[PDB]
Amino acid sequence: STQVSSGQTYKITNVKAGTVIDLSGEDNKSIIGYPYHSGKNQQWTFNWTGKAWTLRSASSGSYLGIEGTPADGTRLVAVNDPFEWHIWRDEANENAFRIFVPFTNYNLDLSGYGDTTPGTPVQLWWTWEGLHQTWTIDRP
């Protein structure tokens, strides 16, 4: 298995679609599912703050975050300040993870039930059984 460790850099793969969390090359702001090609924009440095994880883009230095109130369809975007996430192992595949905004029922969700089309938006959604809300955290 692969340990998630503070200071280390990973790709984050959707279990259903096989695409990765990608900071879009078009705007360096939007977060999308894209096939892995070893881009630094597809690589995320995990820090433990003492209570949560922050995820920093290896290419831009922005953090993985959101703007505004968590809801179904809230878009993931690059943000300036570190944004804190909690990770929980998944029940269907225990080597995979669900990734939550702390103190909520909102987890990362690859949109359209895990559409494999490159460019598909990564968003928040209320937690439920779809495999497109589960992720592996892999060596780059």
Read off the CATH number of the domain in which 76 is found. 2.80.10.50
Residue 123 belongs to what domain range? 1-140
Helix/strand/coil for 19: coil
Number of structural domains (the chain) is 1
Cα separation, 45 vs 7, in Å, equals: 6
From the annotation, which residues make up the binding site for beta-D-galactose? 22, 25, 37, 41
> Amino acid identity of 90?
D
Asked if 122 contacts 107 with a C-beta cutoff of 8 angstroms, the reply is no
Tell me whether strands 44-48 and 76-79 are parallel, antiparallel or unpaired. unpaired
Annotated binding site: 22, 25, 37, 41
Of 38, 42, 37, whose CA–CA distance to 22 is shortest? 42
**For residue 32, which amino acid is it?**
I
Q: Which residues contact 60 (CB under 8 A, 6 or more apart)?
A: 23, 28, 41, 78
Method: X-ray
Exposed/middle/buried for residue 107 (C-beta within 10 Å: 0-12, 13-18, 19+): buried
